[PDB]
Amino acid sequence: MKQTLLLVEDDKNLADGLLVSLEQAGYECLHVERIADVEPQWKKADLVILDRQLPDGDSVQHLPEWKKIKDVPVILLTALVTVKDKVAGLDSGANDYLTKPFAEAELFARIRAQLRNADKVMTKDLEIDRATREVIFKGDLITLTRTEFDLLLFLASNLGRVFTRDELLDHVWGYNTRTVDTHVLQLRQKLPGLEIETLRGVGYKMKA
Amino acid sequence: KQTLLLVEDDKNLADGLLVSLEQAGYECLHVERIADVEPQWKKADLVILDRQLPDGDSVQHLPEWKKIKDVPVILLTALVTVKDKVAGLDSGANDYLTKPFAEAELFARIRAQLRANADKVMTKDLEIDRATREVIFKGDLITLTRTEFDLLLFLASNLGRVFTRDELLDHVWGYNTTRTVDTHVLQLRQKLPGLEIETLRGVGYKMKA
Amino acid sequence: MKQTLLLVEDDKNLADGLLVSLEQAGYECLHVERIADVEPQWKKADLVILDRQLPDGDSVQHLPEWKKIKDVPVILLTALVTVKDKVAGLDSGANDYLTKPFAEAELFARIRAQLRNADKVMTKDLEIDRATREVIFKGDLITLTRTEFDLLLFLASNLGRVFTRDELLDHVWGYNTRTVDTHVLQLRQKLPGLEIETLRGVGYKMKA
Amino acid sequence: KQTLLLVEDDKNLADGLLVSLEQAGYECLHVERIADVEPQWKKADLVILDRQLPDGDSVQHLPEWKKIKDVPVILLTALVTVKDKVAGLDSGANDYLTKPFAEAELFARIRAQLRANADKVMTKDLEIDRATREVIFKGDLITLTRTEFDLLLFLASNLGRVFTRDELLDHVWGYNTTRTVDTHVLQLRQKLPGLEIETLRGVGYKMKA
DNA sequence: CACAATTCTAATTCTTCATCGCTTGT
DNA sequence: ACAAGCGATGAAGAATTAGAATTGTG
Numbered sequence: 018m019k020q021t022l023l024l025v026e027d028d029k030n031l032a033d034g035l036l037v038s039l040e041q042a043g044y045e046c047l048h049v050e051r052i053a054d055v056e057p058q059w060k061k062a063d064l065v066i067l068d069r070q071l072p073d074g075d076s077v078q079h080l081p082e083w084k085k086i087k088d089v090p091v092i093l094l095t096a097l098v099t100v101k102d103k104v105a106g107l108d109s110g111a112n113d114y115l116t117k118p119f120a121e122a123e124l125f126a127r128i129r130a131q132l133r134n135a136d137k138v139m140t141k142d143l144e145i146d147r148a149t150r151e152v153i154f155k156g157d158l159i160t161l162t163r164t165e166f167d168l169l170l171f172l173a174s175n176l177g178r179v180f181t182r183d184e185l186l187d188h189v190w191g192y193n194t195r196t197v198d199t200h201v202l203q204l205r206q207k208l209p210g211l212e213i214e215t216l217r218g219v220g221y222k223m224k225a
Numbered sequence: 226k227q228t229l230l231l232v233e234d235d236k237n238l239a240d241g242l243l244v245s246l247e248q249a250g251y252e253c254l255h256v257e258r259i260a261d262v263e264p265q266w267k268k269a270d271l272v273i274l275d276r277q278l279p280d281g282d283s284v285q286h287l288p289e290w291k292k293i294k295d296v297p298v299i300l301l302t303a304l305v306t307v308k309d310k311v312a313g314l315d316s317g318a319n320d321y322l323t324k325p326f327a328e329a330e331l332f333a334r335i336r337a338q339l340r341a342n343a344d345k346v347m348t349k350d351l352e353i354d355r356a357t358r359e360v361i362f363k364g365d366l367i368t369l370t371r372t373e374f375d376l377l378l379f380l381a382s383n384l385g386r387v388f389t390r391d392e393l394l395d396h397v398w399g400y401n402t403t404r405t406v407d408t409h410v411l412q413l414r415q416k417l418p419g420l421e422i423e424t425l426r427g428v429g430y431k432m433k434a
Numbered sequence: 435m436k437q438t439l440l441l442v443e444d445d446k447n448l449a450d451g452l453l454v455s456l457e458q459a460g461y462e463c464l465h466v467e468r469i470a471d472v473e474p475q476w477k478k479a480d481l482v483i484l485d486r487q488l489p490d491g492d493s494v495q496h497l498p499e500w501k502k503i504k505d506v507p508v509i510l511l512t513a514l515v516t517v518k519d520k521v522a523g524l525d526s527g528a529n530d531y532l533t534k535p536f537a538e539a540e541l542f543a544r545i546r547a548q549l550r551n552a553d554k555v556m557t558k559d560l561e562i563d564r565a566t567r568e569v570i571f572k573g574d575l576i577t578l579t580r581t582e583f584d585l586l587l588f589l590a591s592n593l594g595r596v597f598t599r600d601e602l603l604d605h606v607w608g609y610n611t612r613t614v615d616t617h618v619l620q621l622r623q624k625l626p627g628l629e630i631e632t633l634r635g636v637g638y639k640m641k642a
Numbered sequence: 643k644q645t646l647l648l649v650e651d652d653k654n655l656a657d658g659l660l661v662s663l664e665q666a667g668y669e670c671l672h673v674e675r676i677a678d679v680e681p682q683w684k685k686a687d688l689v690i691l692d693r694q695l696p697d698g699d700s701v702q703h704l705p706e707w708k709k710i711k712d713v714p715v716i717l718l719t720a721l722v723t724v725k726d727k728v729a730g731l732d733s734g735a736n737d738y739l740t741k742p743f744a745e746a747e748l749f750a751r752i753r754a755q756l757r758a759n760a761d762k763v764m765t766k767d768l769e770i771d772r773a774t775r776e777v778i779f780k781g782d783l784i785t786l787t788r789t790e791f792d793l794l795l796f797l798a799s800n801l802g803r804v805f806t807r808d809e810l811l812d813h814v815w816g817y818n819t820t821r822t823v824d825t826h827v828l829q830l831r832q833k834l835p836g837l838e839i840e841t842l843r844g845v846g847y848k849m850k851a
Numbered sequence: 852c853a854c855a856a857t858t859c860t861a862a863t864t865c866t867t868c869a870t871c872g873c874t875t876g877t
Numbered sequence: 878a879c880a881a882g883c884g885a886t887g888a889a890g891a892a893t894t895a896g897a898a899t900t901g902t903g
Binding site for chain 6: 787789819820821822825826843844
């Protein structure tokens with residue numbers, strides 16, 4: 018019961034308030050205010066909420082080439098009026114729509130219904146299927162726990178990315194110190210040929 | 226090719242919208258009552274429902290239909306109340322419309338939900354039949370309750386797909402009680418011997434084969 | 435030990451969805467749109483939410499006589515952001531203020547903060563404290579269940595009120611048929627001398 | 643008679659605000675560091691706290707301060723994001739205010755929080771010492787783990803009252819996982835035989851005394 | 852009265868935390 | 878070599894599935 022999430026919005030306290038309810042909801046969040054920054058986080062993202070009027074042009078015009086990267090449930094949430102925009106937003110690749118002042122439970126409903134190969138995460142000699150929660154290393158499946166599988170998968174999708182151990186507490190356990198090492202050592206000592214290059218202070222990324 | 230379906234008792238606008246939809250390329254199906262929905266649900270690849278039909282409300286019968294063919298169910302009604310948009314979409318509904326609608330708004334929500342036998346299952350061990358609502362494990366006709374008959378069917382459709390106990394009370398029961406499922410499988414190990422249901426610590430339950 | 439709630443807002447959509455994620459939350463709600471309609475819904479409540487934009491005048495000018503009845507946590511929220519209005523809203527009896535745009539979680543945080551003699555609701559030969567959930571009837575103490583005690587004190591606060599059998603179901607059972615009859619019998623058969631006057635195939639009511 | 647307190651390292655702004663309260667008449671205290679924030683917590687009927695402090699954060703140590711006296715508190719900080727606002731309010735706060743503010747705004751929020759031996763307790767058969775974390779239950783000396791002492795602590799504080807297991811996790815354990823309390827009382831019947839703990843099937847637990 | 856959800860309850864599978872010692876660069 | 882930091886060690890305290898009569902109920 019855990020997936021990923023993305024956000025795009027320039028509004029300040031409304032993009033802030035929404036991302037509090039979702040981190041209280043249990044879906045990890047990425048927040049962006051520049052189309053120049055949406056290319057990095059797209060592959061990481063399984064879902065996208067968007068706004069229409071923004072810097073670097075109208076976002077819907079920059080949309081379809083990101084759809085071309087991944088078939089991702091994309092919802093344009095924005096203040097605008099015409100049904101012409103509804104056709105403008107949904108003739109292209111898109112899978113719903115909303116509008117202006119709204120209630121936050123409305124958005125939570127339209128995205129909950131959309132939640133219900135691409136399901137794999139392949140890196141180097143490793144197949145991770147979360148529909149079964151099984152890992153394979155050179156044709157060998159080793160069973161892990163819900164927390165061991167969590168940290169490994171977050172770094173099975175994030176390649177070459179380093180985050181801090183305090184950040185790993187709030188990214189593997191969800192919203193609310195030395196376990197990070199004694200269990201990544203549970204991983205090294207139980208997965209022969211583990212390719213996690215330890216670092217100093219700041220610590221963990223996956224080369225490939 | 227492409228097929229669809231619709232359910233509407235109001236005559237003038239329904240007849241006219243399927244005309245423009247028959248003018249459109251799609252081949253069209255239509256009924257006026259809920260007893261006629263289950264006949265052609267299968268051959269249809271997309272449906273259009275309403276909340277105010279003659280023979281009752283369409284949501285109470287919905288989730289059984291998505292478990293014969295999971296096709297995009299687009300609700301359409303005069304109920305602009307947001308609590309319907311909640312009960313609808315948190316039942317097996319994808320999207321809504323407004324009671325009057327722009328025609329190109331409707332189609333745009335048809336393509337957007339199109340671009341992105343069925344009664345018999347074949348578990349290597351045994352056989353399940355949803356018509357007679359029974360089970361045959363190596364010849365034995367096991368006696369189950371509806372609760373324990375229903376949780377096995379949603380799992381036999383997605384075997385090997387482990388899911389948490391919180392995402393099953395929203396899938397066997399109605400969406401939106403208590404903490405129970407641990408005892409509902411314990412009875413199925415008690416009466417179906419050697420049934421491959423692996424239990425994971427802190428994760429969930431799943432069927433391997 | 436769940437409790438009550440109340441709402442005063444003429445704006446319909448933002449009062450529509452606001453009560454959704456509260457019914458999703460687990461507190462029953464009351465929906466008002468006139469100050470002449472605010473008077474009757476007060477005593478039954480531990481909490482009160484209020485708007486300053488109302489038909490039939492300024493809501494703060496009808497405020498202290500509601501404080502007289504019960505000292506209730508009554509937040510305010512409006513398009514009036516002036517600290518002068520904050521002094522107006524808070525010199526008089528209240529506990530908080532807010533702003534038109536928010537996270538729905540801000541209210542949720544600012545209502546969980548207020549929850550923590552008046553615990554009782556007392557009727558004919560009946561003493562019901564919700565903090566212990568024992569019934570005292572003519573002096574006798576008698577056991578109940580989770581739902582038995584919940585519907586008994588439901589009709590204990592509501593004097594002479596009548597809800598339909600379907601209305602009693604969604605109220606005492608989780609959101610989103612014959613038991614209402616058989617359980618009110620497990621109420622009569624438990625305690626004799628209970629003024630549940632059955633009506634015409636319709637509803638039920640506790641008179642006094 | 644009416645007392646209150648303040649916590650801030652900022653020098654002149656704190657000086658001008660406590661003088662206004664002394665101009666307001668409310669007898670007040672002030673501490674500049676967390677080193678002495680704990681001593682004078684008892685004498686105050688209200689506390690104004692700032693998280694921006696040189697010797698660390700304040701919310702990370704908030705709940706044990708309220709756990710000694712349930713007096714309302716207010717947070718004042720340069721962190722005006724809603725994620726900081728809800729985090730403080732959910733971790734035991736009682737109100738909130740922005741960083742740059744007017745005076746009567748504070749005052750009106752001082753009265754609004756005013757108009758509506760705390761270390762040892764003695765109950766039947768239990769004579770509890772919270773400082774040394776020891777209990778003498780029926781003549782014997784009992785010593786168990788920490789969480790099993792904070793659990794019999796908030797119950798020993800609000801005893802005779804029931805609380806659902808959901809309302810204990812955010813009240814005894816760290817908020818800002820269900821099969822636990824069902825087992826945490828079990829060993830309380832193993833180590834404290836004869837404890838006066840009734841249970842409510844479907845509801846929470848309580849101490850009968 | 853049948854059916855179902857509760858509390859035990861009993862025996863494990865996992866986090867977290869000190870301690871030595873060990874891996875990086877300073 | 879020194880000086881922070883990072884393997885490892887292996888526990889002990891949390892969770893985590895399994896039975897039995899009880900309780901509640903649509």
